[model samples]
Target chain A: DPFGGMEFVPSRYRVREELNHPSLDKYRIDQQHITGGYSFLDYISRAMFEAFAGLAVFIEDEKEAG
Target chain B: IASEDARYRQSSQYELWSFSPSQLASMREKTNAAARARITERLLSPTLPEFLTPAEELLLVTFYTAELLRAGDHADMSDEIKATAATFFKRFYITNSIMTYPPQEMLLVALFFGCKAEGAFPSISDFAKTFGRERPEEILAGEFLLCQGIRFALDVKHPFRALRGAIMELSTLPDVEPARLVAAEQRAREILRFSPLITDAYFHFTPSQIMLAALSLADRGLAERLIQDTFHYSHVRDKVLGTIEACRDMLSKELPERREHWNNKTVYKAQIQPIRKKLNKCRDPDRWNLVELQRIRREQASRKGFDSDDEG
Candidate 1:
């Protein structure tokens, strides 16, 4: 009924109940990385760290978690 | 400014008519805003010089013609048509070089040529009928010659871009109230519409001469009616003369400062160069594969970042 704007057509509306978690908030900022001390800094500073640590690791982790 | 000033200077006659394009455009935008704010019916009315002294009227016509050409540009007319119209207007001035021809005839002629060049040619008979002219056929015959007279120089640097530069400069001015700055900009444009002499002297007369002319009209409101009584253009529409008056009034209000800083050429070039380079690169974006594309942007951004840091 919540997605009944066009009744003749079909659409999907996902609810937390469907996900098997009654209190699952769908949207919120991830505070995990910030708590780990990964600070946003100047381009040179960020680039130096990313280059040595491997930029892909940070990107892959964010994709998997976010 | 010269790649051989000789060939280019052919249009130097128009140099006196010139105003920093941006200054003129800003002035128009501001004036239009003011007119709208006050709900004046004559906001877009054809400017005339009859409201001022004869000398002031001439200056007003030159300025108004320049602004008029600028406005018609925004109307999306073809380059050829615009050139033809401007040439027609310029020819009228060159031939008469005096205030006697009355700007209305020149306006009609210019409009007629412009319409023809754009392939939206207004019917001559209909135009004649509206204006109560006896020999519409005779007037139509002169159209081709008029078009030919302008040497087909259709592309003109107008005030539209310069106005952006002026606005950008104004935005950077510190301790300036946003509303007041905007109001001042609007005032500049409104003041431009009244004097053809300022426009003419700037574009056709010497640059220094033009600037002096503009300042003179703005300050003294003196103009000379130099055309002969037998001038053919004196009979048609009153648009040119009307526009002159409007331009003079605009100048009186704007009283723009003539200073090195206000010159928009440097600002215009600085703004355009990067975009032009980007456009050139975009033409061959595929030449630099995806990796190369990223490299290019990063390289550019990094270089720009470095430059900015140095500047700071």
Candidate 2:
């Protein structure tokens, strides 16, 4: 009766249950490889941003103008 | 007439925040003895000047700005809005002196404008109430002037995003311990929040450089390994290392020691009042006119050159 009273389940709730399935462990790259409560995506993104931080800055022309 | 590209060009810290030696000379010409003295006191100290130094004034404003951000947090405003507001407060002081435009009034204006910039539109009344003010106009009074002071550069790029990028890169390094990478990332975030604000590193280095420096400072062993592994090229490694060292030096330098008496309202008023009076007298309308005239002259010169090329 409780289940019949609420036939609709939110997409997020459904997805959460799906993610908790034991069969999905092999495919969970983040769980297997990432440690220390950090995401691999976040780490790589920071490096890429640092690598290209000031590539476009051309101060020589600005100094000449001034 | 300034194009989007021109705005982008102006966004560079080195291009916009930094001054060349000649530009520094020109800036010195505009400021008075009191202003210079204050700047020197802030930069180096042991001897107290009669007036409040620029660094002290900036620090006071930063304190109030932090308070305002705390209030915003209580109001459930996003961190983006608070950071943008604080940045606005800092940028406004870069061109305008504490003597010319008092930080107390400017702090409210910066927060107000910052909220607007970040698409968090609290009503004028709500904004006023948050800061414990009866009237919104009190905060809005200097909005136009503050805008002019910051040169209307609303888009301030902070080191936070760059810090995230650094963490992302560090975590993905091959043969590195993920646990160590996480620890390094945490330290880097802490450094990002605290270190850069205390020094002139923001003006001198790019956000990316500051972020990397913070990472190096966090875990030197892990940072060195990552640097060697990540940047295989010698030139890249050298440049990154140099910037990190410079950032470290800036962080390690001691700020001018503050006297407890300087924080007293009576003492603060006494220190600031005379400096304000002197700056008011030095405020020349022609200084702004000269700037405007130069801008017009450059535009005309460029237009003439364009016409000549067409004719040819």
Candidate 3:
């Protein structure tokens, strides 16, 4: 049952199933939406996110006051 | 990925171990086909007996996983240790067939190695004796093989801590009752204890998703509410729920209570014994005895330094 693109190397004791690890390099002016699209900012620790939310709020308040 | 899961993405678990269902299945299929060719070649019998397919191998592996958990329970090992051990067993057998290494011994090695991995070190001699072996040689035999077998992805990120964090989040809400919340946690912990270990939940889902799935099993509303509240302001909330739903489906296939079916003697004889009988005939020639194989490989490793007969 070899699927398309499956490598069936029958070595002595076992088979080696190698996969290409996903790479995370991105710089195609690309950090904008391409990178942002993949952001897991939504799922970070709520405590950590809340702490950062404080900064965002503070930054907004400073701008409004100025 | 959240910062938390993004952190997980940096770890070895996500890089090498996590797989899509198709990828994992293809790997298993190739593994079994490879095993069939090699085992058939090495066996001394004139006629080939039945060799286990990948499906049969999965069934037997899962059965022994139940046994591994039972063994862990006897030794009073923590749930984390058992889970790590079980995951070790599952991962090892994916590429290496049960025909190549004895699952019976590999399970013990997993338990022993699992303890080491999880910071719960027990003396190998004592651990061996716990399973009625006089020497630790057999238990120690497969240690490195297992290390390489799992491709050295030693730390398995489990859902236990994620469950704790989720429950902590739930407690802050004013709607849930304390007794109900406490009971839900215990039940979710129980599911986390067994459900994910028996199935491929770890490979396909994130720790947080697995945690949420178990929580949903324990109490749907809390899991739903947490999901709603966490992704309240986001658009991908439904997608997150879909992943947890898929994970929940995998988990429910072998819930905590189903251990009754898996662990029973009658069930083993009827469903599992036939596979074991097939396995006995198809066992490996050079590597069947872990203790024997262990010493052979060690002596080989030691002797390789001399130049007279050694040429790579």
Best by lDDT: 3
The sequence of per-residue lDDT tens digits that candidate 1 reaches over residues B26-127 is 444454344234322433335421222223333434443654455455555554455446645764444332222234445556767777655676678876
Worst 10 residues of 1 chain B by lDDT: B222-231
What DockQ do the predictions score, one after another?
0.00, 0.10, 0.02
Which numbered prediction scores highest in TM-score against the true structure? 3
TM-scores, all candidates, are: 0.32, 0.60, 0.79
Summarize candidate 3's per-residue lDDT along B22-112 as a digit string, tens digits. Answer: 7788889899889889988877548887889899988998999999999999888888888899999999999799888999889999999
Residues B252-303 of candidate 2: C-alpha lDDT, one tens digit per residue: 5522222233445775577645555544443332322333444556678878
> For candidate 2, what TM-score does chain B get against the true chain B?
0.65
Clashing pairs in 3: A40-B1, A43-B2, A44-B2, A44-B3
Question: Residue A13 lDDT in model 2?
Answer: 10
Chain A of candidate 2 gets a TM-score of 0.37
Per-residue CA lDDT of candidate 3, range A1-66, in tens? Answer: 567755433111111122111121243246684656754322324322221111111111222344
Question: Proportion of native contacts found in each model?
Answer: 0.00, 0.19, 0.00
Per-residue lDDT of model 1, residues A1-66, tens digit only: 776653322011111112111111221234764566543333223222211121011111222343
Task: Provide the TM-score of the second chain in candidate 3.
Answer: 0.94
